[PDB]
Short mmCIF file of C-alpha atoms in Angstrom, two decimals:
data_model
loop_
_atom_site.label_atom_id
_atom_site.label_comp_id
_atom_site.label_asym_id
_atom_site.label_seq_id
_atom_site.Cartn_x
_atom_site.Cartn_y
_atom_site.Cartn_z
CA UNK N 1 121.38 58.71 142.03
CA UNK N 2 123.76 57.21 139.35
CA UNK N 3 122.98 57.33 135.70
CA UNK N 4 122.25 53.71 135.32
CA UNK N 5 119.69 53.70 138.18
CA UNK N 6 118.04 56.69 136.67
CA UNK N 7 117.92 55.12 133.23
CA UNK N 8 116.46 51.70 134.59
CA UNK N 9 116.51 50.21 131.16
CA UNK N 10 115.22 46.68 130.73
CA UNK N 11 116.24 44.57 127.81
CA UNK N 12 113.39 42.08 128.47
CA UNK N 13 110.93 44.59 127.42
CA UNK N 14 112.21 44.60 123.88
CA UNK N 15 109.89 42.18 121.97
CA UNK N 16 111.05 41.07 118.61
CA UNK N 17 108.30 39.67 116.26
CA UNK N 18 110.18 36.61 115.44
CA UNK N 19 107.27 34.91 113.63
CA UNK N 20 104.38 37.09 112.38
CA UNK N 21 101.08 36.15 110.74
CA UNK N 22 98.04 37.98 109.32
CA UNK N 23 94.51 36.63 109.73
CA UNK N 24 91.61 38.04 107.71
CA UNK N 25 87.95 37.47 108.37
CA UNK N 26 84.76 38.58 106.74
CA UNK N 27 83.01 41.59 108.04
CA UNK N 28 80.16 39.37 109.41
CA UNK N 29 82.54 37.56 111.77
CA UNK N 30 82.35 38.60 115.46
CA UNK N 31 85.39 40.81 115.98
CA UNK N 32 88.23 39.56 118.20
CA UNK N 33 88.29 41.32 121.63
CA UNK N 34 91.26 39.51 122.72
CA UNK N 35 93.55 36.53 121.62
CA UNK N 36 94.08 35.09 124.98
CA UNK N 37 92.12 31.94 125.78
CA UNK N 38 89.98 32.45 128.91
CA UNK N 39 90.41 28.81 130.21
CA UNK N 40 94.31 28.72 130.07
CA UNK N 41 95.58 31.92 128.48
CA UNK N 42 96.75 30.37 125.31
CA UNK N 43 96.54 31.70 121.88
CA UNK N 44 92.83 31.54 120.80
CA UNK N 45 91.79 32.80 117.45
CA UNK N 46 88.01 33.33 116.90
CA UNK N 47 86.38 31.31 114.27
CA UNK N 48 86.11 33.00 110.91
CA UNK N 49 89.51 34.39 110.84
CA UNK N 50 91.85 32.72 108.24
CA UNK N 51 95.55 33.27 107.76
CA UNK N 52 96.88 34.55 104.42
CA UNK N 53 99.82 32.14 104.62
CA UNK N 54 103.42 33.08 103.93
CA UNK N 55 104.44 36.63 103.03
CA UNK N 56 107.63 38.24 102.05
CA UNK N 57 110.49 38.51 104.48
CA UNK N 58 112.63 41.51 103.27
CA UNK N 59 109.43 43.51 102.89
CA UNK N 60 108.25 42.59 106.29
CA UNK N 61 105.02 44.12 107.63
CA UNK N 62 104.92 47.91 107.82
CA UNK N 63 102.58 49.69 110.13
CA UNK N 64 101.90 53.30 109.22
CA UNK N 65 100.47 56.09 111.57
CA UNK N 66 99.55 59.24 109.83
CA UNK N 67 98.56 62.26 112.01
CA UNK N 68 96.52 65.15 110.77
CA UNK N 69 97.44 68.17 112.95
CA UNK N 70 96.24 71.74 113.44
CA UNK N 71 98.29 74.54 115.12
CA UNK N 72 96.26 76.84 117.54
CA UNK N 73 98.19 80.04 118.11
CA UNK N 74 97.21 83.02 120.25
CA UNK N 75 97.19 86.74 119.54
CA UNK N 76 99.56 87.37 122.38
CA UNK N 77 101.88 84.59 121.67
CA UNK N 78 104.57 84.06 118.99
CA UNK N 79 104.51 80.31 119.03
CA UNK N 80 101.40 78.15 118.72
CA UNK N 81 99.91 77.63 122.13
CA UNK N 82 98.35 74.24 121.28
CA UNK N 83 98.13 71.52 118.68
CA UNK N 84 95.16 69.39 117.91
CA UNK N 85 95.39 65.91 116.29
CA UNK N 86 92.25 65.88 114.33
CA UNK N 87 92.60 62.18 113.15
CA UNK N 88 95.02 59.29 113.20
CA UNK N 89 95.04 57.07 110.17
CA UNK N 90 96.39 53.54 110.59
CA UNK N 91 97.46 51.42 107.61
CA UNK N 92 99.59 48.23 107.14
CA UNK N 93 101.17 46.71 104.26
CA UNK N 94 102.94 43.40 103.41
CA UNK N 95 103.56 41.01 100.45
CA UNK N 96 101.70 37.69 100.38
CA UNK N 97 103.15 34.84 98.47
CA UNK N 98 100.25 32.32 98.33
CA UNK N 99 97.61 32.21 95.82
CA UNK J 1 120.89 105.92 99.20
CA UNK J 2 122.84 109.26 99.53
CA UNK J 3 121.37 110.51 96.37
CA UNK J 4 117.88 111.03 98.00
CA UNK J 5 116.83 111.97 101.51
CA UNK J 6 113.17 111.71 102.55
CA UNK J 7 112.08 113.47 105.83
CA UNK J 8 108.91 114.14 107.52
CA UNK J 9 108.11 117.11 109.74
CA UNK J 10 104.97 116.27 111.73
CA UNK J 11 102.23 118.69 112.73
CA UNK J 12 103.95 118.93 116.10
CA UNK J 13 107.40 119.73 114.71
CA UNK J 14 108.77 116.28 115.13
CA UNK J 15 111.63 115.57 112.63
CA UNK J 16 111.82 112.03 111.07
CA UNK J 17 114.28 110.82 108.47
CA UNK J 18 112.52 108.03 106.69
CA UNK J 19 115.07 107.37 103.92
CA UNK J 20 118.60 108.42 102.92
CA UNK J 21 121.33 109.26 105.32
CA UNK J 22 120.33 109.10 108.86
CA UNK J 23 117.31 106.90 108.28
CA UNK J 24 115.92 105.02 111.30
CA UNK J 25 117.52 107.17 113.75
CA UNK J 26 114.12 108.17 115.19
CA UNK J 27 113.02 104.57 114.90
CA UNK J 28 110.88 104.85 111.75
CA UNK J 29 112.10 103.70 108.31
CA UNK J 30 110.25 103.88 105.02
CA UNK J 31 109.11 100.55 103.28
CA UNK J 32 109.28 100.16 99.39
CA UNK J 33 106.34 100.45 97.01
CA UNK J 34 105.07 104.04 97.62
CA UNK J 35 102.48 105.14 95.27
CA UNK J 36 101.50 108.53 93.68
CA UNK J 37 104.59 110.04 95.08
CA UNK J 38 106.59 111.30 92.11
CA UNK J 39 104.41 112.59 89.38
CA UNK J 40 101.39 114.93 89.93
CA UNK J 41 98.19 113.03 89.00
CA UNK J 42 96.74 114.76 86.09
CA UNK J 43 93.74 113.70 84.12
CA UNK J 44 92.89 114.73 80.58
CA UNK J 45 89.51 115.49 78.97
CA UNK J 46 88.45 114.43 75.48
CA UNK J 47 85.30 115.38 73.55
CA UNK J 48 84.01 113.55 70.65
CA UNK J 49 85.57 114.39 67.41
CA UNK J 50 85.76 113.53 63.72
CA UNK J 51 88.63 110.99 64.09
CA UNK J 52 87.45 109.61 67.50
CA UNK J 53 87.78 112.02 70.44
CA UNK J 54 89.56 115.35 70.58
CA UNK J 55 91.76 116.65 73.47
CA UNK J 56 89.71 119.23 75.58
CA UNK J 57 92.17 120.17 78.39
CA UNK J 58 93.58 118.73 81.57
CA UNK J 59 92.74 118.74 85.17
CA UNK J 60 95.36 118.07 87.98
CA UNK J 61 94.13 115.61 90.79
CA UNK J 62 94.85 115.67 94.48
CA UNK J 63 97.56 113.13 95.52
CA UNK J 64 96.64 110.00 97.18
CA UNK J 65 100.00 108.62 98.61
CA UNK J 66 99.78 105.11 100.08
CA UNK J 67 103.01 104.13 101.72
CA UNK J 68 104.27 102.25 104.68
CA UNK J 69 106.75 102.61 107.55
CA UNK J 70 108.58 100.40 110.06
CA UNK J 71 108.58 101.40 113.66
CA UNK J 72 111.37 99.47 115.29
CA UNK J 73 113.21 99.19 118.47
CA UNK J 74 114.89 96.37 120.58
CA UNK J 75 112.59 96.80 123.62
CA UNK J 76 108.68 96.92 123.39
CA UNK J 77 108.36 99.81 125.73
CA UNK J 78 110.60 102.09 123.64
CA UNK J 79 108.90 100.83 120.54
CA UNK J 80 105.62 101.77 122.03
CA UNK J 81 106.99 105.17 122.50
CA UNK J 82 108.26 105.56 119.05
CA UNK J 83 104.84 104.22 117.73
CA UNK J 84 103.09 106.81 119.73
CA UNK J 85 105.25 109.44 118.54
CA UNK J 86 104.75 108.56 114.95
CA UNK J 87 100.99 108.65 115.40
CA UNK J 88 101.27 112.04 117.03
CA UNK J 89 103.18 113.31 113.94
CA UNK J 90 99.95 113.04 111.89
CA UNK J 91 96.38 114.47 111.73
CA UNK J 92 93.41 114.97 109.45
CA UNK J 93 92.64 118.71 110.09
CA UNK J 94 96.17 119.90 109.91
CA UNK J 95 98.95 118.97 107.49
CA UNK J 96 102.50 117.69 108.01
CA UNK J 97 105.45 118.36 105.72
CA UNK J 98 107.18 115.78 103.58
CA UNK J 99 110.52 116.69 102.13
CA UNK J 100 112.60 115.16 99.45
CA UNK J 101 116.09 116.38 99.25
CA UNK J 102 118.30 115.51 96.26
CA UNK J 103 121.05 117.22 94.14
CA UNK J 104 118.14 119.40 92.64
CA UNK J 105 117.53 120.74 96.20
CA UNK J 106 114.83 120.15 98.66
CA UNK J 107 111.12 120.14 97.76
CA UNK J 108 108.30 119.57 100.10
CA UNK J 109 104.68 118.29 99.93
CA UNK J 110 101.98 119.07 102.57
CA UNK J 111 100.06 115.94 103.42
CA UNK J 112 97.36 114.89 105.77
CA UNK J 113 95.91 111.67 106.89
CA UNK J 114 93.36 110.60 104.34
CA UNK J 115 91.98 107.90 106.70
CA UNK J 116 93.05 106.11 109.82
CA UNK J 117 96.47 104.40 109.52
CA UNK J 118 96.65 100.63 109.50
CA UNK J 119 99.30 99.54 112.15
CA UNK J 120 100.93 96.25 113.24
CA UNK J 121 100.89 92.48 112.21
CA UNK J 122 98.31 89.96 112.88
CA UNK J 123 99.56 89.38 116.38
CA UNK J 124 100.16 91.89 119.18
CA UNK J 125 102.95 94.19 118.21
CA UNK J 126 104.81 94.06 121.54
CA UNK J 127 106.20 90.70 120.53
CA UNK J 128 108.22 91.76 117.56
CA UNK J 129 108.74 95.43 118.77
CA UNK J 130 109.07 96.01 114.91
CA UNK J 131 105.94 96.64 113.13
CA UNK J 132 104.57 98.20 109.95
CA UNK J 133 102.17 101.17 109.76
CA UNK J 134 100.30 101.68 106.55
CA UNK J 135 99.76 105.30 105.79
CA UNK J 136 97.21 106.64 103.34
CA UNK J 137 97.96 110.33 103.15
CA UNK J 138 96.59 112.92 100.77
CA UNK J 139 98.07 116.10 99.30
CA UNK J 140 95.28 118.68 98.63
CA UNK J 141 97.85 120.83 96.76
CA UNK J 142 99.29 118.08 94.66
CA UNK J 143 102.50 120.05 93.53
CA UNK J 144 105.87 119.70 95.18
CA UNK J 145 106.91 122.99 96.62
CA UNK J 146 110.02 124.96 97.47
CA UNK J 147 110.25 128.03 99.70
CA UNK J 148 108.46 130.88 97.97
CA UNK J 149 110.59 133.78 96.76
CA UNK J 150 109.86 136.98 98.55
CA UNK J 151 110.91 140.48 97.34
CA UNK J 152 110.32 143.82 99.27
CA UNK J 153 110.18 147.33 97.72
CA UNK J 154 109.68 150.38 100.11
CA UNK J 155 109.68 153.90 99.16
CA UNK J 156 109.05 157.39 100.81
CA UNK J 157 108.19 159.26 97.65
CA UNK J 158 104.64 160.07 96.74
CA UNK J 159 104.96 158.62 93.21
CA UNK J 160 107.41 155.83 92.49
CA UNK J 161 107.85 152.81 90.28
CA UNK J 162 110.04 149.76 90.57
CA UNK J 163 110.80 146.51 88.61
CA UNK J 164 110.36 143.34 90.24
CA UNK J 165 112.51 140.37 88.65
CA UNK J 166 110.25 137.45 88.34
CA UNK J 167 110.89 133.95 86.78
CA UNK J 168 109.07 130.63 86.80
CA UNK J 169 111.71 127.82 86.80
CA UNK J 170 109.02 125.14 87.59
CA UNK J 171 107.02 123.00 85.13
CA UNK J 172 103.62 124.47 86.34
CA UNK J 173 102.27 127.95 86.45
CA UNK J 174 102.34 129.71 89.62
CA UNK J 175 100.06 132.65 91.18
CA UNK J 176 101.64 135.74 92.55
CA UNK J 177 100.88 137.23 95.82
CA UNK J 178 101.18 140.99 96.74
CA UNK J 179 101.00 142.79 100.08
CA UNK J 180 100.64 146.51 99.51
CA UNK J 181 100.63 149.12 102.28
CA UNK J 182 97.99 152.01 102.43
CA UNK J 183 97.26 154.78 101.68
CA UNK J 184 98.00 155.12 97.93
CA UNK J 185 97.04 153.94 94.55
CA UNK J 186 98.75 150.93 93.30
CA UNK J 187 99.11 149.61 89.75
CA UNK J 188 100.18 146.05 89.54
CA UNK J 189 101.16 143.85 86.40
CA UNK J 190 98.82 141.15 85.27
CA UNK J 191 100.96 140.03 82.16
CA UNK J 192 99.49 137.07 80.30
CA UNK J 193 102.90 135.69 79.32
CA UNK J 194 101.27 134.56 76.13
CA UNK J 195 98.49 132.73 77.82
CA UNK J 196 95.23 132.43 75.73
CA UNK J 197 93.03 131.32 78.55
CA UNK J 198 91.04 134.41 77.85
CA UNK J 199 91.87 134.79 74.02
CA UNK J 200 94.02 137.82 74.97
CA UNK J 201 97.38 136.20 75.15
CA UNK J 202 99.19 138.90 73.20
CA UNK J 203 96.84 141.56 73.72
CA UNK J 204 97.56 141.28 77.52
CA UNK J 205 101.28 140.90 77.23
CA UNK J 206 101.82 144.24 79.21
CA UNK J 207 98.53 144.31 80.89
CA UNK J 208 98.47 146.50 84.18
CA UNK J 209 95.64 146.57 86.64
CA UNK J 210 95.03 149.69 88.81
CA UNK J 211 93.80 148.75 92.33
CA UNK J 212 91.37 150.93 93.99
CA UNK J 213 92.51 153.85 95.99
CA UNK J 214 93.44 152.73 99.57
CA UNK J 215 92.43 154.68 102.68
CA UNK J 216 94.69 154.87 105.70
CA UNK J 217 94.95 151.59 107.34
CA UNK J 218 93.58 149.58 104.59
CA UNK J 219 96.59 147.51 103.81
CA UNK J 220 95.68 144.94 101.13
CA UNK J 221 96.65 141.37 100.34
CA UNK J 222 96.27 140.81 96.58
CA UNK J 223 96.55 136.98 95.89
CA UNK J 224 95.94 135.95 92.25
CA UNK J 225 95.48 132.39 93.57
CA UNK J 226 91.89 131.19 92.47
CA UNK J 227 91.56 129.50 95.84
CA UNK J 228 91.45 132.66 97.84
CA UNK J 229 89.81 136.12 97.25
CA UNK J 230 92.03 138.47 95.26
CA UNK J 231 91.67 141.61 97.36
CA UNK J 232 91.59 141.12 101.15
CA UNK J 233 91.72 144.29 103.38
CA UNK J 234 93.28 143.78 106.75
CA UNK J 235 90.60 146.05 108.47
CA UNK J 236 87.74 144.16 106.83
CA UNK J 237 86.80 147.02 104.54
CA UNK J 238 85.15 145.93 101.16
CA UNK J 239 88.08 147.09 98.95
CA UNK J 240 86.93 144.66 96.11
CA UNK J 241 83.66 146.70 96.21
CA UNK J 242 85.25 149.64 94.59
CA UNK J 243 86.96 147.70 91.79
CA UNK J 244 84.66 147.67 88.91
CA UNK J 245 84.87 144.16 87.50
CA UNK J 246 88.62 144.15 87.00
CA UNK J 247 90.88 141.18 88.44
CA UNK J 248 94.06 139.51 88.27
CA UNK J 249 93.56 136.73 85.73
CA UNK J 250 97.02 135.41 84.74
CA UNK J 251 99.47 133.11 86.50
CA UNK J 252 103.31 133.07 85.85
CA UNK J 253 103.58 130.63 82.95
CA UNK J 254 106.52 128.02 83.18
CA UNK J 255 109.73 129.34 81.49
CA UNK J 256 108.67 132.99 81.52
CA UNK J 257 109.98 135.86 83.43
CA UNK J 258 110.81 139.43 83.25
CA UNK J 259 111.06 142.74 85.34
CA UNK J 260 107.34 143.35 86.08
CA UNK J 261 106.54 147.04 86.83
CA UNK J 262 104.86 148.10 90.02
CA UNK J 263 103.75 151.63 90.36
CA UNK J 264 102.63 153.64 93.38
CA UNK J 265 101.05 157.10 93.18
CA UNK J 266 99.20 159.52 95.62
CA UNK J 267 101.10 158.15 98.65
CA UNK J 268 101.56 160.91 101.22
CA UNK J 269 103.89 158.59 103.32
CA UNK J 270 105.38 156.35 100.73
CA UNK J 271 104.40 152.69 100.47
CA UNK J 272 105.67 149.17 100.77
CA UNK J 273 105.07 146.30 98.36
CA UNK J 274 105.85 142.69 99.02
CA UNK J 275 105.91 140.07 96.20
CA UNK J 276 105.54 136.40 96.95
CA UNK J 277 106.29 134.04 94.00
CA UNK J 278 105.59 130.31 94.68
CA UNK J 279 108.00 127.56 93.44
CA UNK J 280 105.81 124.72 92.45
CA UNK J 281 107.00 121.40 90.85
CA UNK J 282 105.25 118.28 89.76
CA UNK J 283 108.20 116.04 90.82
CA UNK J 284 110.20 115.62 94.05
CA UNK J 285 113.24 116.11 91.85
CA UNK J 286 113.93 117.33 88.39
CA UNK J 287 116.73 119.16 86.52
CA UNK J 288 116.09 122.75 85.56
CA UNK J 289 114.39 123.27 82.17
CA UNK J 290 114.12 126.07 79.77
#
């Protein structure tokens, strides 16, 4: 098998978030299970979610994933036999313009 | 370094060079930070006095040497062989020799395992095949020794007398040992060398003690060492019983020495006297002092 066939890379699977928006809702609002409209598969935002408007372009939106890990090493092994991801913290930050 | 060479002779006769030229040839090297190795531990006594406390004498303590070694090889099987051999070189009941050789000669210390060794790292030692062993050895006799000096005087005359040259080049007093053949009446020196430990330092400058008359076959070992009984008959006779509250009391003080006189009388077949003088030092190496 040739290298290109082994790679089987698709450019269409690369998705560029050309226009991004952030919507916030009070904790009493029913959470959004999905954003796909059941009737026609369009973009359906549940009621109670309100956009934060424009935000900075150069800053963008940064999604941060932080892993807390623990190394399990055995008495009869030099390297750690296993690693445990105790927790995974998710954060996101951005710079809103509107008041 | 080539100025200092540390070796161990195990209880089984194995020879290890832990430091100096040839170190690690047997697979075991010596780690730094070894304690109570150089100076003999001595504690001083103090009694209350007008200006605080007054000096009351000193007592020497047994050595507690805590050191560490590396047992190393490229393959785990041979490392295991070396580690087993190192463990075999030690015991609690019987002692192994630890020699330090420098420009001041070779001096040895007899040491035994004070407690069980602490080997290996936190993981299994076959991974690294290069592991430390923590040794807590003890020296019951805390003084570094050299080979004792032995002198022989044999005679065929019934009455004879000789002068044994004796000298204490060490920094600590030593106790003399005599081996006297039988029969015959022996007179042995017990010179104080100025020692006032019995308030007779100069009264006993030329003190001689006459051992009891020995019957045939009653060869005696006369050791002034406080550890052992002074008179020991080889045949089990109570020779000390016929000795009337007399004893060898004085060691050979440091820096002192002379031609001590040994006299033999009433010996039909002559007699032989052997003098053993130990060479005890408080340090593995030290320049001669006088």
